[PDB]
Symmetry: D3
Subunit: 302 residues, 6 copies
């Protein structure tokens, strides 16, 4: 090792990779990722990779399917050029929120020649076992939790909310470390005590904004005076940022697992939280053959 | 096809297979499954299997690891004898409630030569994708739901309870079809309205009885006048049936995915629900090349 | 068997599949292929496929990478639903005109669960061996050759031209059956006798139009009085049809392996030739377990 | 490297691993191997294994099937934690004395992620080729032969006996190096000259004691004045040690490939021979990338 | 099904296949197997194989390595042409009498696309498990045993001899069914009673004739008045038939698993025994999906 | 690393390997490659290979099929002895000039355990993708081109000829770097200007000499005054060298990818060009983990 590549083809999607590089104190590898006039992808690796430990950094662009082919093709080229290890750093694993298609995607990535994966907060964490190679499915919560603590005034007067019974688990994990109660939404009503409190809605992803909006109206109706949304992944497809701006939600806090330049502008309610540290530390450990055990002991928001 | 085998080695674990056979209107295949004096397993298939479609029926005995080897070894023998298809009918998939070991188990089953699986109510249903062959992960709820309706008096005065936030999803699925509210437990308190109601606790499995007992004491304390437990799988390890008998739980309703002869005697609070119909219908469809789509339209409790 | 699906998501790309169905005298299978708001693909198979022989028909749309995922995902769903055979009918295999990426594409298709392929006129025909399953790499020339004969006046006063030395082989195959001479182009000059003759340029594909245009100007300069282009695949990316309309080329004759609605309108010089017969016959043979040997004895332009 | 684990869950089965560690001059790795109340196994690796060369030492306990799962599960965890190499040191390979089930066992071990094996005196040595990874199938005879020489008085007045024609090969290998004659048993009679001699019966395993007892009575009847049994593996199932104590056999000499605490007490005729040296040397070579060629030049009984 | 091919390229090696065809009452398939001037092999299958059950019959010629490539190449062509099953009928499996190279050979045969094997009397029968597909490893002894009975006068005054302790097992199997004693050879002496008796030496193969000759001289010296050799496989390499003619051996009886035209002429002591019946019956069962169980109940020498 | 082996069994075929060793400045590894009297192959590796990087050098002898088995068997032994990498250096890949059999050959080589390949001038270069491991398909042209320049007087008065339209590509590649015109042959005539010029016929292989002879007679007839043939591979089967000696061809220039001792004597028109440099440099790079990028910058004829 060690070599970092980005398999992304526009500036906005290469931001994360750029931050990870600044943190490790390295240059990015040279590559060209573009598109032929027939819309086929072209990856072209502009340096020796032989014997090296290569971390390919790949975020999800607007064109997810093209994101995949850029990744697959690049991984394949690294295999052909006899890289020693080909670690996918794919913080947001696509096709993962439901024949289980996240399995199929995992295979093609393995068949292409991936030999390790690093990723954050998998929609179902059983997807780790969809691969036939080692996988790190990383936590983002410490960074969100620490945000709640430092950036939300009056948090001890909050209640952690789950958008649906499916999110109840994650709500509980937040409440526990914040010593708080939980409420869970389930058209729809509420279970729990929400009146006269800040309500912090907690999920792994926010993309389809519908049932985040319904959660906000109900929580408002039952006397919650401030509504937040914390999610790992800010997919925020199509007219999400507008529907948020107009709505009861006071703030949306997501990480930078997925680039969302435009939506930030369309909606100043969206607050991004930088995660490159969790990512650069995972890569540092994996390169040096250190344990993963901790992994948060010395890293923070800061 | 069609041939049915049991890979179980004691009468109690062959009950289900026997019921499935009575339903399809067939003889069981001849096999011997026993144990050498050194405690190695012996499977011995006493008939031609060549070209045939073979459904191996395997429930979990006290000695789960031996259950596995009996299964693996039998599947292997069917492969060697050139069976056309080897369908595992493994209603309770072991090592499935949490390196994800249910993955490893799935591989060995595939490598052994399994070519299809039929199973009920998988702890995480993403385990379907741990295999590299087709899988039916079957519902048991219609049969439990219909029990609630017919065998519980005053059910419309119930609230469906989730033992932990993790079970919140399944509680919601029950409440919905029964037009009811839900409560969820999370030592511990309660979220929801439980006073002056029947409380029906709903999970996929009951084995470790601890947090079923705590759920019952709290539900009792908050004025729930009758406590039920419905779970697909009645593993009911060790001194479960006693701890239940003594406790607040008024009734425990499980299916026969897992044989539990002794525990029924140790505890008349346990009510088993027969499931062979769901199992014989899945096998009927799969043999005839029919769709699975329905699968409950014409079957019932009855 | 037998079931036909299209994995295409717009009317223009489903034309071929529709013609193949009319020829075999069958209904198309029910499926939905669309796109979520986050631009992930959705395939949804609306009928039993179990035990059946399923031919998935897939042409290449503008968004080739999405074409791939639609295909891959559909194939995977057919595998999950226990289809007996899953034959890809992919008349134009993408990423095939140059780590050899057409290999990678072939693997993912096999890993996804393809069990046979049918395709026409592969850029390099060694790509058949990039798969680990049987493949038919079909001829289109008899249909083009028969066009030359019937639709070109004065063809015996032609010379078959190869755009580059790479196309020399295919030119020779055309000349031979038409009892004609060949010329080959190689900025650039010409080898052969082209003066006072019709010049028919012959390739497997036309997408990047550049060196077709240079071939036409030179052939014009050396006294060829009429310039044709015959190619199997009419990819015709971007501003191809315009550059053709303006140019020396008098006519472009391509098959319908690739849908090109718009380009036909942008350029009446483009003449499409229907190929569904070669495709329906290959499918007829493969379903009935007949030989492929002939395959053209009884089919024609007509 | 280098890390040693035991996948055994009781003191008696961890003895060998403990001796191997004392010989190499290392600490054992930290692990927990126990059993849940439902009798599922739990392995838990209490240290970083990443990048390391890991030798998992596994002897066969009373519950052989559980021995397997403990092994399989541990190997899998080492794979997940990205060990560089996972060498099984499995001195007694179970299910090996006869669909050939020792093949199936070998696969699951490979599929689990084993990358090398070390083992002693395989029932059929063709089992090496049941794996898809390198295997050392180690000799124990030099250590038994040297015992005969040093610990048997009057050995030159022995005849090496084969229990059945199947053991004739191994008898011959012993006679040769001891410059002696052989006899072979085949109810039953004898081939060879046994009168007025010490008779040393030589096999790879002793588990089912039946035909060792018949061999002893016949050898006694034909005037052999002292009967020994030397076998690599002392499985010694069930009421073996008693049946030996009562019988004509004067001494049974086995190695410690298989722990047999209880049987030693039940029968002082059983003499164990320590083999950890052959095992620690094989591990020393394999770690250092040295040849195996010798392997006995410098090791002995001592 | 059903189609029979021979992958042999000279008349003498196609004899067996021809007899198998006469027995089943079928024509042989059309194929061409020859050699280019550069000595590469050419197989060319002159008929549709699609959907069919194809039994490729392959004996070992003088040029064993070419025998392999002819086989491998043919199997591959049958895979490409989408045969439903490709059963190798390879009565003598080469490279089988000792890295275990018979394993490697088995893989290439599986990778090539073999899906079943039929073979007789494998040097080590554990080689069945070197494949990843079903295998029948067939007996030849009933046909040799019946020869002893009918074609040897005074057989009850024989003793079955094993050339080396390694052959002791097989000698015992012969003695048992003939109710006789055994002797075993081990330069060299004898164990057993051979004086004044016919001595029948019994092995699976005879190729290297050396230790058959030494066995004969010793057996002669100890008063055996007539020496026979029965072996399944008559490889009989190089100057074997001469060395036999000159020697003490009175008769050599082998099967026709391996063609030996020339050696019969060079040595009228060699008596071949026809085996096509065992082979045609195995093929009959396997085609019809019948059991193999018997397999000798109704077949004989005759 | 590093260890070099030859898997060839006669002096003439070990010449290349010997030159490669002299260039790297190393001893060859000890091995024995011979043939048993039954004509099976024997490879026997006479040194530790464990952990080492092993380059097996294999040229094609008269008996190509035996060349294959020698290679396969040796590769397998290196796998068994736990070599770290097993690089095939197989400058002439057999069965490569046309079910595509070069695919089958590639698999068996991979299955045997090859982990890298080095080779020169593959008949179709798509054969790289027939493997599932990295491959270097090396150029020989710089060494032939430099020969033309230095060893042919009056080369600027040449025209590069393609034997058939299939060779047109390679002719063009030669003309380009030599700034010359091309002619292409296609019984037969000529396309291009050949009168009063030296004609240099350029192919990747010369084995079947037929259409080289026809190319020479026609080129002579149309006034070409001197005929050369340059090809990478000098297979030169059977009575090639004689047919050349008698013919119009003035000179044949081939590399030493394939040993041709006898043909040089039978025909002084054949001029061999040493290529060990391209081969030793490829091996140097691959051992040191350097790029391949250049690969000719510093090497030459010299
Ligand atoms: Cl999901
Ligand atoms: Cl998280
Ligand atoms: Cl879980
Ligand atoms: Cl359920
Ligand atoms: Cl190309
Ligand atoms: Cl074509
Ligand atoms: Cl055995
Ligand atoms: Cl031993
Ligand atoms: Cl052997
Ligand atoms: Cl036999
Ligand atoms: Cl070719
Ligand atoms: Cl070249």
């Amino acid at each position: 090792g060690l070599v970092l590549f980005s398999a992304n083809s526009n500036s906005s999607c290469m931001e994360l990779s750029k931050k990870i590089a600044e943190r490790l104190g390295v240059e990015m590898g040279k590559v060209q990722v573009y598109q032929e006039p027939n819309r086929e992808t072209r990856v072209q690796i502009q340096e020796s990779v032989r014997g090296k430990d290569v971390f390919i950094i790949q975020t999800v662009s607007k064109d997810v399917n093209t994101t995949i082919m850029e990744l697959l093709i690049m991984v394949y080229a690294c295999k052909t050029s006899c890289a020693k290890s080909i670690i996918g750093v794919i913080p947001y694993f696509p096709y993962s929120k439901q024949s289980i298609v996240s399995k199929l995607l995992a295979s093609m990535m393995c068949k292409a020649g991936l030999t390790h994966l690093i990723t954050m907060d998998l929609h179902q964490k059983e997807i780790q076992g969809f691969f036939n190679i080692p996988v790190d499915n990383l936590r983002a919560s410490p960074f969100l939790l620490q945000y709640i603590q430092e950036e939300i005034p009056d948090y001890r007067n909050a209640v952690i909310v789950a958008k649906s019974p499916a999110s109840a688990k994650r709500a509980q994990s937040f409440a526990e470390r914040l010593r708080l109660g939980i409420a869970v939404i389930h058209p729809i009503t509420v279970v729990g005590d929400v009146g006269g409190r800040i309500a912090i809605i907690v999920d792994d992803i926010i993309d389809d904004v519908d049932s985040f909006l319904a959660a906000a109206e109900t929580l408002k109706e039952r006397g919650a005076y401030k509504i937040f949304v914390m999610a790992t992944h800010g997919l925020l497809s199509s007219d999400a940022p507008r529907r948020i701006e107009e709505s009861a939600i006071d703030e949306v806090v997501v990480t930078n697992t997925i680039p969302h330049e435009v939506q930030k502008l369309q909606c100043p309610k969206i607050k991004t939280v930088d995660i490159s540290m969790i990512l650069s530390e995972a890569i540092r450990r994996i390169h040096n053959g250190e344990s993963m055990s901790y992994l948060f002991r010395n890293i923070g928001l800061d």
